[PDB]
């Protein structure tokens, strides 16, 4: 066998066809961004939540 899969049936691991090494693949960082603000009638400063 060459490559693996997870429960969600997506590529999880691969095999390098030059050194017979198995490499785990993980997606690089991502997420949601929310903005915490008071009213614009009060201030213009904000905070950010990742």
């Amino acid at each position: 066998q060459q490559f693996g899969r997870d429960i969600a049936d997506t590529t999880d691991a691969v095999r390098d066809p030059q050194t017979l090494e198995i490499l785990d693949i993980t997606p690089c960082s991502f997420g949601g961004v929310s903005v915490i603000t008071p009213g614009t009638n009060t201030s213009n400063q904000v905070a950010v939540l990742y």
Binding site: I7, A8, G32
Partner: peptide, 30 residues
Amino acid sequence: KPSKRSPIEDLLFNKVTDLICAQKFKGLTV
């Protein structure tokens, strides 16, 4: 106990119970 729970609350919390990461990688978060 470090949770400050009662002898029955602990039993209830014990009696109720990679998939999370796999679903997160599809865009579904909790």
